[PDB]
Amino acid sequence: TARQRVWRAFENPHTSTMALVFYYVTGFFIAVSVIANVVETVPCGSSPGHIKELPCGERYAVAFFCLDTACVMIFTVEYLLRLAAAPSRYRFVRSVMSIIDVVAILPYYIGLVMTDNEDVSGAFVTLRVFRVFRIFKFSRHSQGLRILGYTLKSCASELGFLLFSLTMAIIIFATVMFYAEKGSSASKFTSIPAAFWYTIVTMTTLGYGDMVPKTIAGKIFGSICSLSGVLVIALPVPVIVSNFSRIYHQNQRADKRRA
Amino acid sequence: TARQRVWRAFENPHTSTMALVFYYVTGFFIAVSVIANVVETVPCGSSPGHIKELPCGERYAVAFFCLDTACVMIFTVEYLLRLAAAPSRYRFVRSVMSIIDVVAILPYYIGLVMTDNEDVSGAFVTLRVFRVFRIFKFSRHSQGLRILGYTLKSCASELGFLLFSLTMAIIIFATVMFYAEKGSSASKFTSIPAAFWYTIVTMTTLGYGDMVPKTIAGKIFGSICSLSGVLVIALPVPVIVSNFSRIYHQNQRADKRRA
Amino acid sequence: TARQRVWRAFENPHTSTMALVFYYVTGFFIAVSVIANVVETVPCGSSPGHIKELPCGERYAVAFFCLDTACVMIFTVEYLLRLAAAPSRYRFVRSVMSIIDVVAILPYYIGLVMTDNEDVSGAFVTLRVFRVFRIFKFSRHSQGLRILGYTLKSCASELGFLLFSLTMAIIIFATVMFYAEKGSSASKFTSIPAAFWYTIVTMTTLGYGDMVPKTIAGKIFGSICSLSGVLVIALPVPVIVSNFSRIYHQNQRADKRRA
Amino acid sequence: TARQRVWRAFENPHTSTMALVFYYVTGFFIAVSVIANVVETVPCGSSPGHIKELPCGERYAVAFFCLDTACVMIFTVEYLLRLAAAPSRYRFVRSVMSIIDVVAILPYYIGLVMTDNEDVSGAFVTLRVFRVFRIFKFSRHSQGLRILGYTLKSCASELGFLLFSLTMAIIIFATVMFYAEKGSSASKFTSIPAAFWYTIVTMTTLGYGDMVPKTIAGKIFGSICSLSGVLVIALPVPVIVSNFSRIYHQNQRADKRRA
Numbered sequence A, B, C, D: 001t002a003r004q005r006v007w008r009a010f011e012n013p014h015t016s017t018m019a020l021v022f023y024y025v026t027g028f029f030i031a032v033s034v035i036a037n038v039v040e041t042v043p044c045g046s047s048p049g050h051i052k053e054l055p056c057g058e059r060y061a062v063a064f065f066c067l068d069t070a071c072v073m074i075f076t077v078e079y080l081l082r083l084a085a086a087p088s089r090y091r092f093v094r095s096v097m098s099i100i101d102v103v104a105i106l107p108y109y110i111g112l113v114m115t116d117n118e119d120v121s122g123a124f125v126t127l128r129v130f131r132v133f134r135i136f137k138f139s140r141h142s143q144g145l146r147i148l149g150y151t152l153k154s155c156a157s158e159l160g161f162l163l164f165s166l167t168m169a170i171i172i173f174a175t176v177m178f179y180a181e182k183g184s185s186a187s188k189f190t191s192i193p194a195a196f197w198y199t200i201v202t203m204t205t206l207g208y209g210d211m212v213p214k215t216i217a218g219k220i221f222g223s224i225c226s227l228s229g230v231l232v233i234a235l236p237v238p239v240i241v242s243n244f245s246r247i248y249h250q251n252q253r254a255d256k257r258r259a
């Protein structure tokens, strides 16, 4: 019953006090790792002796590395405890939580095994990006988040086809804007993929203003694009809200069945 | 029964396997033509021997022309098969799908017959714009798109009058903004059609920022315009959503009648 | 029965053919006057002999004046016919439609009586602004517009208090943004009324970008302002939509009572 | 019965005429103080003899100080009357209205006791900011505002977790945008807290345009951020509206129970 006791402790933390305190320690270390990742990029100061303003992750590289390795050790010990104390280890490994944990902890091990090629450029940037995934471990630390996830999975097809319609609208508007605006002086509409940016910024009603039409036809089609974006701000809400509310009522009915 | 067999194959592709595979080939060629049209405008590179960075559609003009003519041949053979194997050929020709197909394939034939006047300027740009219509042939490759089309046709009058009210609001706000802002130094509000752009960008809550008021009265009326745009982002949703939901329930009731 | 016959012709145009054709002529002249007012500000061309690009309303001043006086004559004859053929003339004069008609036609008569002081500056600009009100005469040429007007009148108190809450939010955010951003170099936050513009542009999710915070505290409070604007885009919709739908159902019930 | 008479006069102003007129005087002085605070920052003019354009609160410092001290005297006399004539003085002091009143009136007394250190910098700015809280005393002068406050208190947990999800989305998008855009020339994405601003401006569909991506990966992730903001403009509305409507129906049912 040891393995099942440990798995019961992990899966439902509130069942015990030791399990719940280990849960809170794990959540605290997740927050520490996220805050350290965010903070290590802040330029701390001039650091006299160096002209460039070094980030906190380079002026204090050893301290941040110690914090990161403590967090990664905690995460990997937790992962090994979960995997070795699961009713079905393969089912655990294939699960979304497990792959998130592995892809969160694994960049640290690549950085360890790339210590010989310390002059790596670009790949380590992708590894540090993938280190953002440690925030997703807060999914175990919420309940409405899983409700939203189930709602999204139930709206996967509808939202996918809505995105497909949005994509064809993007292509149409980008084509017309590129052809209407390719002739302007020093125009940013240098291609249709270049007008993808303008179209996606216009139909979301951002309007950064870096790419704006400068021709009469371009302005007319930009106005049509804006009006289409007004409807874009209302096309996903009905399906999403209706599906979420249906799930809400169904969950309440399940609760009353259990009661 | 040959003509009716071919028309049954075309209209409902899933009835057979040959019809469905020809359907998927046609959809694949539609996607190929759309991607080629989007890509041919991307500047591929310096192309040594030419100072200007030529687009992919001009450095590799022969390859893109071969791809385009293969796609157009497939489309026109499909169109002839559909027209010659229809229960009512005139009804086919007048249909929206047929006119979309014709206006998609016809710019290629104009480009063929304009090969003598290869120095054409402007008209060929419009032809290449109208080549975007090949994306619309994906309408046959969706089911919710037709539901949205029927909903739009049922909301044609309501949305038309809503657009008319939006237009009168645009005219009013453009007039007041032009008269409040015509006196500024190097102002972009050079006319009321010039303020149409500012009004349509403001009431959609884009705010590009190229045209902003610089006078106190201009800023007051721009604030009123912004507040009106807040309501603009909510005026089409009730009619559109209510009509679409009514169509949804009516379709479900039709399904249950058939069941 | 002459006066009542004329008033029946005016009030319900569809009752006859002469009344309906006079209605359509009046609507056509309203559209002509609106289009002429919009077009007279467009710079037509260089007009050789003058360096400045004169607007259409000044290069062709006599033609636009003739069109304007024809439109004003039609409008004032219509107004006199309505007033002299009304069941209660005072009730007509106090009505909103009558005041709109008078304030639309009256700037022309001021321009006539100000022909001696043709060098007027500023006041004539306000008169030309008030000439925009001729668009509002399209209210008689719609039915859903009156439904929206009744809905607005029924939501007058709720929308007024919502605007009051929006105003107190504007004042709070403008105060905090001004005090956080008054110290920046060449800052646009020169006063709290100056930050009114930033606050109203931010809580409507325009983001023109002319006034942006440049301090950390300013950016924090701008983020709070943006998040508040997200709720601003949803605070008027429930009251407006609920009231409009209640009016819709009540009108349908009235129709069924009459049936 | 004196204390209870005074407290009944304060709590429900409409019970009497003296209580209601004192209520209206208090509201008028609140509006006077708010308008004076807003106006004292407006640059009145050149004020010959001084090169800088002094604000109204410094060219006319004595008049604004007299107005402010009259308003503060009225507010503190009202506060003492409320506290000394309350059924439970401690319950009054701990109440939200009381702390708002105290923090509104108290900056004036700090300014009095800091008259020796008149060269204070920064702290007095915070005091003048906290003087904005006098607007909140209009909470006693509304009824729907308390309905919104109760609705917010009932949605405190749901909106808090929604803000937490928005925060994790902000962190993820800021990380990816910083790492995609840190390499650009003179990029504003100098850190992840620096990209917090871009992310919060993008997911609210502001698009100021001061920080825009300049790399292909940055533009792709900015497009994803924009699409997420489209859903952000719809995630708080269902919970807020449903809770507010439930409170509405419950209040109507309470009214009918009392009837």
Ligand SMILES: [K+]
Pocket (backbone or CB within 6 Å): A206, A207, A208, A209, B207, B208, B209, C206, C207, C208, C209, D207, D208, D209
């Ligand atoms: K902008």
Ligand SMILES: [K+]
Pocket (backbone or CB within 6 Å): A204, A205, A206, B204, B205, B206, C204, C205, C206, D204, D205, D206
């Ligand atoms: K927006």
Ligand SMILES: [K+]
Pocket (backbone or CB within 6 Å): A205, A206, A207, B205, B206, B207, C205, C206, C207, D205, D206, D207
């Ligand atoms: K915007």
Ligand SMILES: [K+]
Pocket (backbone or CB within 6 Å): A205, A206, A207, A208, A209, B205, B206, B207, B208, B209, C205, C206, C207, C208, C209, D205, D206, D207, D208, D209
């Ligand atoms: K914007």
